[PDB]
Symmetry: none
């Protein structure tokens, strides 16, 4: 026997990241980014665990945050972290276990004017928010206050992700809300208010591999804010790229969840309007 | 969720190809040339091709023959290998005009000319882009490069001419008199070539050569194809002899050897390859 199939890649990766020549660090981040973007969600989870890529990227985020840099390396480091945590609870837990949450609050606090950095940070945290085992770790009052403030950002590609975090946290019910119930109730109201003011974004703000994490949100009839965010999200990606997303919605079972909303008697009007809109475009997908 | 993976990949490539740090740009373009050569073909990137063409343009505007330009031309050369779609994308983005401008700017840089002609040899292989190569200035420039005393330059100019001539006389829409001169010059020029010191090229497949092998009425075309087979078979026998055989090269070469009125120089080289393929026991 000898050491495992991944140790060579692991020690080259580390040599690149810690090199005096900053071009080697740019190399590693470019490599990680392109593999995060071409490989499948299970290869990236495998490789992410074996090379400890979450820990490696988080230490570049820290260095960049200490230097108050905001360069292209930091942007691709964060978008890699975002893409690796996509549909990957094991990667989301590596982030939490490496002080990712404290570090990302540092990032949001140090760069409050850099909306594309905030987008990448809140998109990652939106993925943590989808993992129920990780819900305890996000109930940190400083974090809820900060993202409750980002919820009212005028940039939709920032507030969209703040709203996603809030929507998932509220959707687990008071049983799991460890702060005051009044803040959760008022967050729920702000969630619903904020979403109704959103312009149609010009670009796609986000890409999804699966609609699964949205389906528990669609059944939350006693928290319309949570439902509204889910159906607004679906409406946004489906309307912007129906080839990829409409077929994905149907195949994963979206139709029962949408008809359940339409048919449900007492339904928030805004939730109902967007649901039937999604249903009717899905219907022309004959 | 995450960011659009296709757009992330392009943004990374844009960041490294166009980077202000020139050591980083040179590295990126070096890595892209290696990966294009080692990955499998097609499954297309046309975005990289536009980025690389931009760098060629800049290096021509600044009139600098440097390693970055050579790596960049190597990258395009390797991206067009057996990739008709990438070739077409090259044509559609003014590539023929930009390369003419490189040939005219660096008429003494053989390193540059080889990489340029290597890529154009790849377009010449694509029957559907043939009419894109019937350009008088272009055929005029490479027809004189056919006679360069550097075989790593003339070898690829010969290949362009061989493929274009192979398509027959109706397909040739420039002056028929030139085509006729080119026919004789192709055969005459090849007989003068010394043995190259190094491998000039790598091939994933012999398939583009097989049509040339049956051009008995245009023996310069056949002579280019067999001289090329002989060259890579002799330098890299472990790769090319086995590839020739497995793709049916003994049949194509015996058809030449057993053809009655074969140009003697074509016959000479076909039997050498045939013998060398067979000592490859």
């Amino acid at each position: 026997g000898g050491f495992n199939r991944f140790e060579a890649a692991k020690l080259v990766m580390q040599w690149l990241c810690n090199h005096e020549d900053q071009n080697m660090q740019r190399m590693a981040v470019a490599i990680i980014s392109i593999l995060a973007a071409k490989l499948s969600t299970e290869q990236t989870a495998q490789l992410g665990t074996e090379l400890f890529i979450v820990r490696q990227l988080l230490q570049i985020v820290k260095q960049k945050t200490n230097q108050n840099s905001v360069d292209t390396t930091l942007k691709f480091t964060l978008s890699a972290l975002w893409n690796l945590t996509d549909e990957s609870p094991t990667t989301c837990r590596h982030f939490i276990e490496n002080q990712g949450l404290e570090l990302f609050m540092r990032v949001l606090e140090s760069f409050p004017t850099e909306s594309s950095i905030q987008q990448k940070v809140l998109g990652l945290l939106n993925n943590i928010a989808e993992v129920q085992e990780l819900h305890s770790e996000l109930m940190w009052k400083d974090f809820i206050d900060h993202i409750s403030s980002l919820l009212h950002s005028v940039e939709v590609e920032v507030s969209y992700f703040a709203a996603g975090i809030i929507a998932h946290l509220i959707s687990r019910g008071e049983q799991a809300w460890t702060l005051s119930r009044s803040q959760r109730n008022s967050l729920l109201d702000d969630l619903h208010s904020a979403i109704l003011k959103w312009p149609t974004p010009e670009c796609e703000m986000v890409a999804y591999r699966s609609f699964n994490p949205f389906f528990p949100l669609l059944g939350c009839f006693t928290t319309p804010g949570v439902q509204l965010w889910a159906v607004w999200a679906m409406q946004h990606v489906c309307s912007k790229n129906p080839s990829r997303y409409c077929s994905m919605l149907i195949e994963e079972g979206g139709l029962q969840h949408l008809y359940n909303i339409k048919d449900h008697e007492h339904t928030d009007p805004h939730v109902q309007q967007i649901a039937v809109a999604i249903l009717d475009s899905l219907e022309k997908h004959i």
